[PDB]
């Protein structure tokens, strides 16, 4: 069925807004009726077809068009859902929390405004993908790397704004942000930091500028529409050595995490540490059906088969060394020696891997900032599906790591899904990441997923583990877990929302922030 | 003469507030009349005694007391000026922008709530000084370094909040912040990040939490009172080797900066790179009168004598190597070879320095996070004085460095002061700092200081160079330089101010932000 109107908005107001939008961007750039279906969540979760349905989409070609759209949204009380490229698959794609919202899709604003080799930065518009920025760098021969998520068709901007991550030393994308331009909810435009000074040549060199540091408030936010963003890029290193360390027992994750802690805190491991479980790594190059006829999750005997077929452990730590050989060698000594006495441990460099198609060769590309789309092949583990993830924060402790693995793998399997988990460390933060692959077409799998997901949130929150990024469906649920002092923080978010966006026309429900008209 | 009432505020209103403060914190911790003097700017600039005059101070012992003081301040329209320890010398000390404001001094809230060695962090109240935190760590033998902004009797919190800097790899103090508790302008209390989740053990492990990133809005801000703050602490490295590289010609700073850029952008130089002018460094161990008895700034012939006497250059690049010897050697090779071909260059490690009281031996302490009061020595250059700083930000270019040296050195000397310069480098940013030592007791010196400062700012802005931190006297003036799109950014700051602080009772005028009742 069709999307309903957003509540409080008549057909006449919607119809008028949509025609006014068209006068701004052109009639070819407003999408209604059958043209809306790319804007739906590709990985459907609700069995209720009235939920999370975009009414329409508008695709501007400039900041000045964005500003006009936002003015028109306020005129008609029609809410917008800003996306940079709208490829937030796992988190709802380009779909809004609240049905009836209109997607403001900025993919056509795709100017690379600057790439600066000597200072190691780019200034990009939202529509620039990782492929595009990577391609531009290679074609100009600049000695710079990007930092990519596992998949490269998303937005350098959009990803950063949702607190996305990659797998080089610059893997905390928002932390590497510097300078931005924002269209505020009233349609006026501002620049942050040194961008606020006329004639500056420092916008992308110095984060703070002067006064309150506000860039952060426009991440995981509905306070503004970002139209330009600077980002630091890593100079090409003098060397690069990707590695895989595998562990034969599920219980090894406890001691593994203890050994990871001082190496990450001291910065001996230079990129994000990712320790992936067997099935998650195996699903890159293989399907369940090739090892197992069963309908349900794999049994232990299959696991042992897979390990030996693929030379993977139950836990698989990928990382990389960057810099001159003498540095890489020193850091490696410390890393290898931290794990050598663990019964069953295996160590691998690319030249040690006997398969042409192989997990370490795959992840080696990502850890040097090469964009690809191969990661989507893991969705075929169980025939073909979508995915959704649960990625709360815990201390980098063996106990926290194995508690969460025990907690989650039992629950996920209880609902018939294979456990596909990952223990990730940024700098001081561990995340047990649950990855759930599901038949999105099946109302019954959908129902099981929703129920499982809610259990995971509550059981983690009961342990003081909080999620930092989530699907549109769970944004309210996650917001409600940050309840210290009777939800004091969200009360402050709502206050700021009401001040910047009195009419509530940017992304109602994003991060569980609604605005006075709708709460 | 004595401090005037803040405009709009009855004398009865003030007496009532002050009475009610006294019952919140006890009579012994409300300071008027003779006990106000410590809260005056110690380095006066205004010759008008009506300005920056605090009416009173209140010194609470807990968050609950801060909340009550804020609520009272709202009731009577009495403005507060929050300080953590109030040692902001060169920037106004503990004095407010607006006369009549009451200082909210949180010195006595000096609990070290947690130092955690395995995760490298501290959670501190505002009154915790660098001396106190260091001493704590040493007493317990925790293998952690702090990062000190030279002077040790300042606040870990307050310094970070004003975007202060130190001289180890953890030198961007606000960047190392993680979690805070804030009393908002209405008296309610919030925790940011994971602190917003009950039962978390992750407040100091993961900055973002969920939703908008807001910690930054409480820095260089009057949007709230910070009452707790986490900060990341560096694990003790396996090795430490500080160094000094001197250069004998003032024009060398051009090529020096060009060579620093790649080294810093790539992180080969691991800490804050300071390049200090001769007089700034010499003034640590000698006075002007040892070399020259004239009233004005030193001539070239004296500079040469000073250089020979102290083993200092016209430019003095202090930095440090950190970690295992193999790493330090590799990094040193790249650093040395960057500077080795410059005519007149000299390299020193500590063992090379003949003087027993010596710049490099002092700076060696600072660059491994040892709090000291030595830096105050440069105030004795010309018999005794205070100082003020002008700290604009530039790109790391030779051309920008030398342009700024020439512009500022010219002007400072013209106005009868010696040039003391500190080209510091963060990550991608050149912060050419001028430090001006003057006789704060002398009305004529103050007058010509003011006149020089105003010129330095205007001439910097004309080149696209903006200041990132300033003295209370100049906060409006600096704010007005960030004027892109008809002051768009301050208009947004003022919108947020009015939402969070409608009565405008927190530090009116901080960072040029005033609130609807006073603009
Ligand atoms: C197999 C697989 C692997 C993945 N791996 C990763 C990974 O390694 N790392 C990772 O981070 N993610 C990963 N993802 C999640 C996600 O698909 C990517 O992060 C993706 O790049 C995000 O979409 P995007 O870049 O187009 O951002 P967008 O969809 O454009 O933006 C995401 C959200 O940010 C906000 N937003 C975006 N732009 C703006 C703006 N200009 N103004 C205001 N708000 C804005 C909106 O809330 C929007 O919904 C993975 C997903 C899958 C299925
Ligand atoms: C000789 C000399 C050398 C110096 N060297 C350095 C240096 O190397 N690096 C450097 O960074 N600085 C330096 N300074 C400047 C300054 O003296 C220090 O930065 C000092 O640490 C700042 O004072 P404080 O720590 O007591 O902070 P405070 O004075 O307590 O705080 C400064 C400001 O922050 C805000 N603030 C503080 N606490 C709160 C709170 N709890 N809630 C809300 N707002 C708050 C207020 O606006 C306040 O006025 C130097 C100064 C001199 C005189």
Author numbering:
A (entry chain B), B (entry chain A): 1 to 519
What does the paper say about this structure?
Enzymes of the vanillyl alcohol oxidase/p-cresol methyl hydroxylase (VAO/PCMH) superfamily are found across all kingdoms where they perform a range of metabolic functions. These flavoproteins share a conserved FAD-binding domain and a more variable substrate-binding domain that enables interactions with a range of substrates. One of these, the 4-phenol oxidases/dehydrogenases, catalyzes the oxidation of para-substituted phenolic compounds. A fundamental distinction is that the oxidases efficiently react with oxygen producing hydrogen peroxide whereas the dehydrogenases hardly react with oxygen and typically employ other proteins, such as cytochrome c, as acceptors.
Pro151 was substituted with isoleucine and valine to mimic the N5 environment of EUGHs. We found that P151V and P151I can operate with oxygen although they are 10- to 40-fold less efficient compared to using 2,6-dichlorophenolindophenol as co-substrate. The crystal structures of the six P151 mutants were also solved. They are closely similar to the wild-type regarding the substrate-binding residues whereas loop 150-153 locally undergoes localized rearrangements, with each mutant adopting a distinct conformation. In general, the oxidase-active variants (P151L, P151G, P151I, P151V) all adopt the trans conformation that slightly shifts the amino acid at position 151 away from the flavin. The analysis revealed a consistent pattern: in the oxidase mutants, the 150-153 loop conformations create tunnels that lead to the flavin re side.
